[PDB]
From Swiss-Prot, chain A:
Primary localisation category: cytoplasm
Modification type 4-aspartylphosphate: residues: D56
Residues that bear N6-acetyllysine: K91, K108
Cofactor binding: number and manner: Binds 1 Mg(2+) ion per subunit.
Essential cofactor(s): Mg(2+)
GO BP annotations, alphabetical order: archaeal or bacterial-type flagellum-dependent cell motility; chemotaxis; phosphorelay signal transduction system
Pfam families: Response_reg
NCBIfam families attached to this UniProt entry: PRK10610.1
SUPFAM superfamilies, per the entry: CheY-like
UniProt protein name: Chemotaxis protein CheY
Function text: Involved in the transmission of sensory signals from the chemoreceptors to the flagellar motors. In its active (phosphorylated or acetylated) form, CheY exhibits enhanced binding to a switch component, FliM, at the flagellar motor which induces a change from counterclockwise to clockwise flagellar rotation.
Curated annotation (Swiss-Prot), chain B:
Coiled-coil boundaries: none
Its biological purpose: FliM is one of three proteins (FliG, FliN, FliM) that forms the rotor-mounted switch complex (C ring), located at the base of the basal body. This complex interacts with the CheY and CheZ chemotaxis proteins, in addition to contacting components of the motor that determine the direction of flagellar rotation.
Localization terms from the record: Cell inner membrane; Bacterial flagellum basal body
Assembly notes: Interacts with flagellar brake protein YcgR.
Family indicated by similarity: Belongs to the FliM family.
Residue ranges crossing the lipid bilayer per the database entry: none
Protein name: Flagellar motor switch protein FliM
């Protein structure tokens, strides 16, 4: 993929954001921005420039599902890739997310290999 | 019902 692709990493924990950012760096992706919740994320996204979103599920203010639905209904970002990275793993939620258009899902804790593979996968697709 | 990465993989990845 375009090494210049702009990623948005959304998670309440800076440590998790750090992990994701580092792995992206490993893959050759350095154009990364961070967000603490769905609202901040959406705010940045609407400002323009993004090519990929990595987000947690349960978040204050605006959760991953709402973020996802909002993105999918947007006139410009409807197809924006959205990778869920979260501790959440209930069948119901996987379904709802699948239904809503999530591009992928990685369960925390994840191995570097897992995240990287899923990433590559989405780029595929 | 908790799905494993593998299981989830079958529907989302």
């Amino acid at each position: 993929a375009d090494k210049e692709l702009k990623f948005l990493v959304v998670d309440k924990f800076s440590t998790m954001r750090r992990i994701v950012r580092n792995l992206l760096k490993e893959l050759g992706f350095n154009n990364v921005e961070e967000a603490e919740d769905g609202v901040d994320a959406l705010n940045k996204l609407q400002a323009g420039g993004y090519g990929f979103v990595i987000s947690d599920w349960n978040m204050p203010n605006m959760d991953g599902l709402e973020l996802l639905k909002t993105i999918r209904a947007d006139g410009a970002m409807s197809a924006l890739p959205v990778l869920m990275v979260t501790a959440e793993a209930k069948k119901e939620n996987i379904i709802a997310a699948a239904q809503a258009g999530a591009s992928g899902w990685v369960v925390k804790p994840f191995t570097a290999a897992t995240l990287e593979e899923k990433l590559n996968k989405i780029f595929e697709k | 019902s908790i799905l494993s990465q593998a299981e989830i993989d079958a529907l989302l990845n």
